[PDB]
């Protein structure tokens, strides 16, 4: 519901001057967003569900291809009527036999030939349609106010200390204005519009493995096919039937069925987990606007830590350029703001890492609290310190 | 699969009020409405209302308008209602339920139904 | 004193079709789609119908909805003891904006 540890993050910071930020969520990313003198949050698209579906066609792979006919005629008889060929209880299809006295016939040629087989359906690669008013939305923000390595990730906490929240997004009301106590509020208007991917794909269901497949790969494959009826069309592929035989028998083989036609064209179309009824869109993407002249710092008439600080580890590289750690405050005093910044050498004036953790404090009174603090350092070396003086700590990094 | 487990039985005097809960599971909570109805005993199903999980918008049932609250808690996936002013009448088993995946109001109807509370009202 | 009229009771041997009506107005079956439930005795209802005849997953086809004008019917063919409950119509009503029923029906399986 927060940024931190997620591969699929992105840093932001909206504009000069900017109290609001445009913005692109996806699936399994996150987003942090910074604004001069305001907290930082993140937005994150947590679900994407469909809370009416339908089918468009239905390729087979098959059995039933064990009844046989082969209604025969004798050289200028004319041609063959198989009865069979009434209704489609079978796939009729007519031929020639070199024949004559040698196989009952009178005269010596070519004899007309109408067998036909039966035709069931088995395993359905069914596939269906995704209409762009059952599309909601869940957008969680988090606040990145006081943290500790630990209550950092527990939703609950962090809602508790009204530093989080997890509200939806519709069609109907695209929009929604999530407050966070004294941190104001934030108001983002997200547009449900997306490709994201558009509908333009096609809902391919094979099994078990369900696949979001081009509209034409699957519309214009080769493979007996039904659209919403038991009727099924162009069966023909009950092939390899013309062994070109005799008035008795002519051989039906059944094709064998080979999944890699389909296996083989998996990589192309994207998977996806669907229920029944349910496609999970991860296919998706959402354009928002987080508007944020709502959104408010806290505790900023409170004066400076003035105590010990101490480290509580070797801080860790988040893998986007921006690194962690948590400290510890030796301070018996109260709710106070942490003097921790990026000096490029120690015993600088001036900082030069900018803190994603902005205006970071000891949330307690209660001496020895803890406080995560994510910061992205300058590249090459550097130092992160905290307290000034006697009393100031530090420890050296060096980005790449 | 979703699941709605709902609140024990209860009795209650005339005059009295109750709020019956239904905890959600198995899908997204913030994106589903949620329906209450209930049932007197032996008698239909009576609509009661509905409430978006998303803002806490309610819905409810003109008869009913007056002494119904619905509400939601979003980090416990938890729906309540509470029926006040009871009268014997006010005798039911109450539902709470899921709606199919309406993304408007008008058209939704209860799809995933929770086995239902028992609510007694007697002197 | 239900918004959609049923018969209070509905019977049937096994194996037999039986249907259930439904009778509505202009402002609710005849302009908007109907759905049924059924309601096993001592069970919460499930939907069985939606959309004037469309089943969810696990529902068998001998289970089939219609409408026509201003009423709805519920067919059950093959009827099996296991039948035995209370269906109950609805749909949405214009008119007073919200989900209407109809009053319900207690189908029970003869001998």
């Known amino acids: 519901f927060n940024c931190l540890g997620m591969s699929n993050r992105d840093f932001l910071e909206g504009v000069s001057g900017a109290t609001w930020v445009d913005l692109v969520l996806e699936g399994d990313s996150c987003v942090t967003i910074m604004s001069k003198d305001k907290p930082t949050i993140d937005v994150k698209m947590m679900n994407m569900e469909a809370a009416n579906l339908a089918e468009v066609r239905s390729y087979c792979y098959l059995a039933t291809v064990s009844d046989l006919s082969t209604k025969a005629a004798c050289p200028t008889m004319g041609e063959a009527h198989n009865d069979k060929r009434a209704d489609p209880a079978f796939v009729c299809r007519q031929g020639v036999v070199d024949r004559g006295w040698g196989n009952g016939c009178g005269l010596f040629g070519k004899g007309s030939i109408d067998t036909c087989a039966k035709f069931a359906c088995s395993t359905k690669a069914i596939g269906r349609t995704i209409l762009k008013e059952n599309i909601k939305y869940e957008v969680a923000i988090f606040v990145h106010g006081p943290t500790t390595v630990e209550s950092h990730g527990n939703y609950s906490t962090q809602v508790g200390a009204t530093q989080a929240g997890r509200f939806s997004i519709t069609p109907a009301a695209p929009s929604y204005t999530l407050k966070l106590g004294e941190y104001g509020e934030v108001t983002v208007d997200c547009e449900p519009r997306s490709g994201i991917d558009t509908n333009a794909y096609y809902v391919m269901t094979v099994g078990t493995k369900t696949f979001l497949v081009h509209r034409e790969w699957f519309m214009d494959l080769n493979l007996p096919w039904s659209s919403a009826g038991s009727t099924v069309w162009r069966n023909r592929e009950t092939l390899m039937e013309f062994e070109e035989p005799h008035a008795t028998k002519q051989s039906v083989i059944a094709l064998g069925s080979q999944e890699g036609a389909l296996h083989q064209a998996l990589a192309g179309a994207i998977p996806v987990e669907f229920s029944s009824n349910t496609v999970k869109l991860t296919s998706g993407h959402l354009k928002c606007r987080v508007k944020m002249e709502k959104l408010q710092l806290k505790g900023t008439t409170y004066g400076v830590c003035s105590k010990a600080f101490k480290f509580l580890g070797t801080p860790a590289d988040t893998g986007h350029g921006t690194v962690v750690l948590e400290l510890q405050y030796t301070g018996t005093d109260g709710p106070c703001k942490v003097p921790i910044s990026s000096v490029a050498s120690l015993n600088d004036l001036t900082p030069v890492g900018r803190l994603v953790t902005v205006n970071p404090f000891v949330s307690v009174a209660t001496a020895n609290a803890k406080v995560l603090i994510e910061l992205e350092p300058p590249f090459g070396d550097s130092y992160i310190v905290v307290g000034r003086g006697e009393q100031q700590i530090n420890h050296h990094w060096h980005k790449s | 699969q979703v699941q709605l487990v709902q609140s024990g039985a209860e009795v209650r005097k005339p005059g009295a009020s109750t709020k019956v809960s239904c905890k959600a599971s198995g899908y997204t909570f913030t994106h589903y409405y949620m329906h209450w109805v209930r049932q007197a005993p032996g008698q239909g199903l009576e609509w009661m209302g509905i409430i978006n999980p998303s803002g806490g918008s309610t819905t409810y049932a003109q008869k009913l308008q007056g002494r119904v609250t619905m509400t939601r808690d979003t980090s416990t996936s938890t729906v309540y209602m509470e029926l006040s002013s009871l009268r014997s009448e006010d005798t039911a088993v109450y539902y709470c339920?899921?709606?199919?995946?309406?993304?408007?109001?008008?058209?939704?109807?209860?799809?995933?139904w929770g086995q239902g509370t028992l609510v007694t009202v007697s002197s | 004193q239900s918004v959609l009229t049923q018969p209070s009771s509905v019977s049937g041997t096994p194996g037999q079709r039986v249907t259930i009506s439904c009778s509505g107005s202009?402002?609710?079956?005849?302009?908007?789609?109907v759905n049924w439930y059924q309601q096993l005795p001592g069970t919460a209802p499930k939907l069985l119908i939606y959309?004037?005849?469309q089943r969810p997953s696990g529902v068998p086809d001998r289970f089939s909805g219609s409408k026509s004008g201003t009423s709805a019917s519920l067919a059950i063919s093959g009827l099996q003891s296991e039948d035995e409950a209370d269906y109950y119509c609805?749909?949405?009503?214009?008119?007073?904006?919200?989900?209407?029923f109809g009053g319900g029906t207690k189908l029970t399986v003869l001998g």
């Open positions: 339920a899921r709606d199919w995946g309406s993304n408007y109001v008008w058209g939704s109807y209860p799809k995933y």
């Open positions: 609805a749909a949405w009503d214009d008119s007073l904006n919200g989900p209407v």
């Open positions: 202009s402002s609710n079956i005849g302009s908007n789609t």
């Open positions: 959309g004037n005849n």
